[PDB]
Structures are given as structure tokens and as C-alpha cells.
């Protein structure tokens, strides 16, 4: 609402209230083609997301928790003293590309590319996902993961050469038998536009996610509440 840096003001202004979100994913995992649509709202003031996702092609062929990181970090809450480090909002409204490779230990990998940008007043995240080399009897295609999600801190670093950011981090998915399925993420983000962006000092994001079901919904779906806060600069 009041920042002495006009570049920060420009990005904050687009995220000042509740912003509607649309998520589209087209996926192919070991030749099972599927699509997911999601709708909800983001409130960057509190770092809060609320989304509901539907598999529009029938039953989702992989477990919903494996898609949480893939299915909008511009809604992170950056403390006032860290707002000059917020790459994600500084790239708006033209947006950014978010690319990942996700390696599931002892199993296959996801390769994702997403464009995150405004269409009018709506923040859209449009994703293509390709998954290969998964085991039919593994934890992913065998749906052995529990329907829950662990809190996680992720380290963000600038990539000055690409005018973007980079991160590598591990997600632990609980398996029904009490064990864990590791998912190693590599991520890079680059701006879509050619204007300047804020390139951050090293810092981390703290995330927490809660998964639930809509008791009146017959389609395969996931309801997601996420909180993300930046930290690590004193």
C-alpha cells in the first residue's frame, strides 16, 4: 500500500486484494492422458490460497498429492522488509514461466512447463506435464500415497544470467505403510516480458498445505488450502 520503491509498488498493487485463480493442466503419464481444472482465490496479504481441482477426464491416474507443487508462488506473503526480493510479483502482469523436473526416487519423473500470467483480472496457471518411466506397481501408479501433505521450506536463489530464479528441493510424500516417497524437485523461473524484474537475494519460502474433500462432489477432485511465507532475511 505504501513503498518507497515504485517498482515494488507496481507489483504489490496487482495483489492487494483477493485475486481469482484458474489452473489448467494437460498431462500424460506413461501414456495415461488426463486434464485437471482448478478454480479458487489467492490473498497474498496473508500468503493464502484456496483452490478446488477437478479431473475433467475421469479418474486421475496419479495421486493428487504428487501434483500439489505443480498445480502459484506469486501469492506468497513477503514481509515488508523483503518486498524488494519478490521476483514472482515483479514479473506480472506479463508473467513468468515455471519449469520443473521432478524425480520420484526409484520411480519415474515429471517434466512440467507452466505459464503464470494475468488474463484480465484472473491469474491463470497453464501447465503441461509429461511423466515417463513410472513403475506400474510403484507408489505413484499404484496409488499408495496418503492423502496429506507435509510442511516444507524451500530455498530460492537468483539466476542472474537468465534474469530469473532457481530452486532445488525435496518433497517427502507419506506412503500408506508409514514409509516415505521422496520427490526431488529442480525448478527454474524466467520472465515472459522483457521489462526489468526484481532479482532476489537468497531467501526461503515456508509452506504449509492442507488437503481435503468436498463431501457433495462426485468427480475426482482435491480441495487445497495453502499458506506460503517468505523468510530468512533479518
Curated annotation (Swiss-Prot):
Coiled coil: none
Effect seen on changing residue 76 to A: Increases fluorescence at warmer temperatures such as 37 degrees Celsius. In GFPmut 3; highly fluorescent mutant when excited at 488 nm
Result when mutating residue 149 to H: In mut1.3; shifts fluorescence lifetime from 3.03 to 2.78 ns. In mut1.5; shifts fluorescence lifetime from 3.03 to 2.72 ns. In mut1.27; shifts fluorescence lifetime from 3.03 to 2.85 ns
Superkingdom as given in the UniProt entry: Eukaryota
Impact after mutating residue 83 to R: In Topaz; shifts the major emission and exitation peak up to 20 nm
Originating species: Aequorea victoria
Biotech use, per record: Green fluorescent protein has been engineered to produce a vast number of variously colored mutants, fusion proteins, and biosensors. Further generation of mutants led to more stable proteins (at 37 degrees Celsius for example) with brighter fluorescence and longer fluorescence lifetimes.
Organism classification: Eukaryota, Metazoa, Cnidaria, Hydrozoa, Hydroidolina
Mod. after translation: Contains a chromophore consisting of modified amino acid residues. Maturation of the chromophore requires nothing other than molecular oxygen.
Subunit structure: Monomer.
Effect in UniProt of substituting residue 149 to F: In Sapphire/H9-40; exhibits a huge Stoke's shift, with an excitation peak at 399 nm and an emission peak at 511 nm. In Azurite; shifts the excitation and emission spectra to shorter wavelengths and increases quantum yields compared to BFP
Impact after mutating residue 37 to R: In mut1.28; shifts fluorescence lifetime from 3.03 to 2.76 ns. In mut2.2; shifts fluorescence lifetime from 3.03 to 1.94 ns. In mut3.3; shifts fluorescence lifetime from 3.03 to 1.88 ns
Record annotation: effect of changing residue 207 to Y: Gives rise to yellow-emission variants. In EYFP; leads to yellow fluorescence, folds faster and more efficiently at 37 degrees Celsius and has superior solubility and brightness
GO BP of this protein: bioluminescence; generation of precursor metabolites and energy
Effect of mutating residue 46 to N: In EBFP1.2; shifts the excitation and emission spectra to shorter wavelengths and increases quantum yields compared to BFP
Name of the encoding gene: GFP
Keywords: Chromophore, Luminescence, Photoprotein
Name of the protein this chain belongs to: Green fluorescent protein
Effect caused by changing residue 166 to Q: In R10-3; matures to the red-emitting state with excitation and emission maxima at 555 and 585 nm, respectively
Effect on the protein of changing residue 109 to T: In EBFP1.2; shifts the excitation and emission spectra to shorter wavelengths and increases quantum yields compared to BFP
Record-stated family: Belongs to the GFP family.
Function of the protein: Energy-transfer acceptor. Its role is to transduce the blue chemiluminescence of the protein aequorin into green fluorescent light by energy transfer. Fluoresces in vivo upon receiving energy from the Ca(2+)-activated photoprotein aequorin.
Amino acid at each position: 500500500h505504501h513503498h518507497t520503491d515504485p517498482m515494488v509498488s507496481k507489483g504489490e498493487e496487482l495483489f492487494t486484494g483477493v485475486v481469482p485463480i484458474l489452473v489448467e493442466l494437460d498431462g500424460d503419464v506413461n501414456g495415461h492422458k488426463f486434464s485437471v481444472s482448478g478454480e479458487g482465490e489467492g490473498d497474498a496479504t496473508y500468503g493464502k490460497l484456496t483452490l478446488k481441482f477437478i479431473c475433467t477426464t475421469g479418474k486421475l491416474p496419479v495421486p493428487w498429492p504428487t501434483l500439489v507443487t505443480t498445480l502459484v508462488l506469486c501469492f506468497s506473503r513477503y514481509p515488508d522488509h523483503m518486498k524488494q526480493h519478490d521476483f514472482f510479483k515483479s514479473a506480472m502482469p506479463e508473467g513468468y514461466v515455471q519449469e520443473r523436473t521432478i524425480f520420484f526416487k526409484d520411480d519415474g519423473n515429471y517434466k512440467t512447463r507452466a505459464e503464470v500470467k494475468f488474463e484480465g483480472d484472473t491469474l491463470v496457471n497453464r501447465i503441461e506435464l509429461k511423466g515417463i518411466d513410472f513403475k506400474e506397481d510403484g507408489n505413484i501408479l499404484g496409488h499408495k500415497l496418503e492423502y496429506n501433505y507435509n510442511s516444507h521450506n524451500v530455498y530460492i536463489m537468483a539466476d542472474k544470467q537468465k534474469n530469473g530464479i532457481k530452486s532445488n528441493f525435496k518433497i517427502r510424500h507419506n506412503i500408506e505403510d508409514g514409509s516415505v516417497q521422496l520427490a526431488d524437485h529442480y525448478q527454474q523461473n524466467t520472465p515472459i516480458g522483457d521489462g526489468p524484474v526484481l532479482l532476489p537475494d537468497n531467501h526461503y519460502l515456508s509452506t504449509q498445505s492442507k488437503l481435503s474433500k468436498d463431501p457433495n462432489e462426485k468427480r475426482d477432485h482435491m480441495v487445497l488450502l495453502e499458506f506460503v511465507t517468505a523468510a530468512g532475511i533479518t
